[PDB]
Amino acid sequence: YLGPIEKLSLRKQRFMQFSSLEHDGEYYMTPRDFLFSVMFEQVERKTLVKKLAKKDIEDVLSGIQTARCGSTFFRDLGDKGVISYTEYLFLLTILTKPHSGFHVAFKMLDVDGNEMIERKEFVKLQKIISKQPGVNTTLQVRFFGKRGEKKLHYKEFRRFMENLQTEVQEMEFLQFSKGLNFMRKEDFAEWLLFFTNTENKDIYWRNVREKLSVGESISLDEFKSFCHFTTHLEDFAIAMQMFSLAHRPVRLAEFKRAVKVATGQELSDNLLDTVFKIFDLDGDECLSHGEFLGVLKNRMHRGLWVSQQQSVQEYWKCVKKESIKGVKEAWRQQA
Amino acid sequence: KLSLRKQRFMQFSSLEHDGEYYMTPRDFLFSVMFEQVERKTLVKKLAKKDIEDVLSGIQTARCGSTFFRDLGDKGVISYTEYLFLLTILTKPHSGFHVAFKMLDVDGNEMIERKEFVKLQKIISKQGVNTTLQVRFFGKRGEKKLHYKEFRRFMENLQTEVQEMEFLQFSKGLNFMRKEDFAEWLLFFTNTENKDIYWRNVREKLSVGESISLDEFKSFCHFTTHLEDFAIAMQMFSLAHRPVRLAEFKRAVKVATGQELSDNLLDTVFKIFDLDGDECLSHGEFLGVLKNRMHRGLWVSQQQSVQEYWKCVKKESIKGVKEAWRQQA
Structure with missing residues (x-):
């Protein structure tokens, strides 16, 4: 054709469209925001973002544990949870790469070689999987316990990915039926x-x-x-x-x-x-x-992605800018 | 103008017959190991009777990882069989089970000689009788190729290429x-x-x-x-x-x-x-x-864009040299 085609990521755009909580200049999704963001492009009611305090955001995920930790995990929580942007990109990658097991990333974070990782590794796992301080969150509590004591075993992570695929299937089915x-x-x-x-x-x-x-x-x-x-x-x-x-x-x-x-x-x-x-x-x-x-x-x-090829336009802009600023000096020293 | 794979085939193919060019098994091994022939292989012209005696090497070769080496020059390998073997080498995990199950019309785990070129062409996208046709389907196409025999061939072929390269460099x-x-x-x-x-x-x-x-x-x-x-x-x-x-x-x-x-x-x-x-x-x-x-043998995404841009730079120099002539 006439250009290379770059796959431009709208993942952050989607996140900002559906996130309903903010706390200290950082935005967050509830589980319900997450499910509807993976199913739809646009939000039904442009409701204004709740601005929460440390105590408030602690309370959002407080009275949980009520959720059935299988394939109704996210549905059952309703809005009673918190999901960070990097956790979101992680969850998106699990949905758009359903056959991936990410065993290399897990094992690279499994320093003790016990098929488990620690809470400290979770964000690294999230950032590697989805490449193309901090408040407590629903995923942190589920995988690593309430104060970061237990560790995420790989088979538990595999089961979580399976339940997530299932739950998106069943929730899309409920929306369209x-x-x-x-x-x-x-x-x-x-x-x-x-x-x-x-x-x-x-x-x-x-x-x-x-x-x-x-x-x-x-x-x-x-x-x-x-x-x-x-x-x-x-x-x-x-x-x-x-x-x-x-x-x-x-x-x-x-x-x-x-x-x-x-x-x-x-x-x-x-x-x-x-x-x-x-x-x-x-x-x-x-x-x-x-x-x-x-x-x-x-x-x-x-x-979540959009193909484009405006590389040639930037090329031309740079050609014209450089040639102009080179004539502005080559001939204003000539005649 | 030729593709990289066709260029290598023309570089190493030592047999000609009816205006087509074929490889022996030795030609194929060196084809994947090297980019340039050393002696410039003399191209031996062949007529009907010749390629039969060439084929006759299958009587005596083992079917494990010394298959191609045992044949030496006693074999015939066509261009589409060559792209097929290339792809097995340069995509060693693929399995190709989908193409196999699509050509396996009778539901069993087997394909007939009639499907073999289909299999080659699908696996390689991005009736002269040959060594592989005879190995898989018999001299007269009278047998069929089970998927397991095919997979184990692929394994043996990887192993043979490793062992041969080791010998060339050791x-x-x-x-x-x-x-x-x-x-x-x-x-x-x-x-x-x-x-x-x-x-x-x-x-x-x-x-x-x-x-x-x-x-x-x-x-x-x-x-x-x-x-x-x-x-x-x-x-x-x-x-x-x-x-x-x-x-x-x-x-x-x-x-x-x-x-x-x-x-x-x-x-x-x-x-x-x-x-x-x-x-x-x-x-x-x-x-x-x-x-x-x-x-x-393969170009890759990054090299494709980095050549697209050298073509853009070429046509841009051509463009400014044209539009300058549009003044005087």
Whole structure:
């Protein structure tokens, strides 16, 4: 093309959009801020940031321990918790890198070689995982106890990452099902296209209206298995290139076989027929698998990054500035 | 105009037949070890009957890690089979299970000769009869390639390349001078601070130090875990802290899960201690490891942008020299 493409991080922008606490020039999320920030770009009520005192912020996470420390951990806390920005970037990386185990970072912080780390290492773990004094916090209390006594064992960290993936799945399901125990395929499409603001949506929504019939729905199990699929989009993309090279079109049983090989799972016909019908951009019986792959990528990244290439513009600006300030001295000494 | 991989193939391919060019197994081994032929291989023209007798070497070669060496020149390897083997070498963790399971139409763990080129082309993206076709599917395509046999081939191939490189740099012996290990390590690195590396080799090493085949293999294994090693170094880099010898050995052990000898690691440290502190210049070291892994056959992101910008500078000088002529 005409430029290198830098992936620009909107993670801090998202954090500032959803954080509802401030204390001493530092902003913080409640667990609820965190869940909605990973699901949405914009906040529903621009409510003004609560400015808290040392005692107040201590009280926010005080009366906890009530939370079920499995996959309803964050939901159960409501607003009763505190999450720092570096902890946020850590949590974002766990969601957008679901297959990563970060064993190298853990072991590098496991100085005693016991498969455990100490509270002092937690922020280092956060900063390495998410590269591309201090008040007490919900994660600090959970992993390292109330006054920093216990240590985070690796298998506990693995379980926490698993419960976090699950909890985002189930909370996204509750938002798009309007709590109501099944998800209309209209709403599943809404979810699927959420981070795809590229204008092409006319055909997707006309497809949704015409092709799938009123009353059809999916369950939480179908939704979870599709999220799993989405985390295997790179395997799916290999299977798609093996059709792109043979110049062959992807029909419905070919789509289903590719999906089986990507996930190792048997997704339901109810799900995969709907997905096919939606991304059958033309009237043919063929998957427009390119734009589908694009949409799975949008879905996986959650609006947290934006590609750009204004490197050439800065280059030109610097060329013109330097050449001008060089002529301003080369010729004002000449004639 | 040719790609790096096609350029290497044309550099080392010694057989011609029907206007196509083929490698023997020996050509392939030296293809991945070196960038320039020494004698300029005489290209032997072939006709139908010739390549059959060439193929006949498969009757007698073992199928473990001495496969390619046993054949010597008695074999035929095509260009797409070459990109396939390259990719197995330069992406040694990949597994390729997805491509296999997609070509395995009958649900079993096996593919037919008809799928083999598909497998090559997919694995390598970013009916003349050949040694590999005969090895995998039989002389007449009468058998099929199980995934396990394929995986174990990939392992044997990595092992053979390690053992052959060791022989080339040990000059046939069961020990490799540390100077020659350094020659191998820097072999796909251009000339940057090359003189510092070599001054270090000369001054920091005592005469007659060597490494075993085991040590060389442990270092090749380490080289395949360079991204794990990179994470370990970036932790130090974010702590604004230097990598001394003990931290080097701990990083290597954690990136490898294996115990590399002090004999090897102290030499590696001393070589890449560019500034003469007792701290490891680990940015330049990690660059060399990537060099080594890619064998000069792949371009990489950073070099792609740094060439895009040299093209931009070229066209910009052309642009000012044009627009100047637009006045007089």
